[PDB]
Amino acid sequence: DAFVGTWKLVSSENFDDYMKELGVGFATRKMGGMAKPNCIISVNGDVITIKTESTLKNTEISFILGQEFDEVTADDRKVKSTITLDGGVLVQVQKWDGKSTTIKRKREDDKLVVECVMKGVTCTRVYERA
């Protein structure tokens, strides 16, 4: 399983615009923009865990594929999230207040590539094994 590992952010495109679309205020966008998180992905049986570690904020989710769960996001949104596997890509949708965002996690070569979309905005974040 190409996703298991500890992954360090190495590049990011359009993350500020994405955060704006999420409703994140300026001071918090400022901190989030300069963060270089680690993403730690593990699996045991049916249960996938994704841990994000950074100096300004840590988060953790554990989920079963196809099973909706409640999540509090890093920016404090209370969302309903569902994550499925579609041709080897982990696809997560977060829904709240009639809005939604999609986060796709893909393995490409040596990279974990994460594409985040909300409205017209597409952010791409690349991570490499720690």
Ligand SMILES: Cc1c(C2CCCC2)nc(N(C)C(C)C)c(-c2nnn[nH]2)c1-c1ccccc1
């Ligand atoms: C929404 C979000 C936030 C919010 C809090 C600050 C304002 C935005 N911070 C993150 N960082 C930078 C770490 C420090 C928690 C990440 C993030 N999580 N992993 N890497 N980056 C994400 C995120 C990125 C892409 C896909 C899903 C979630």
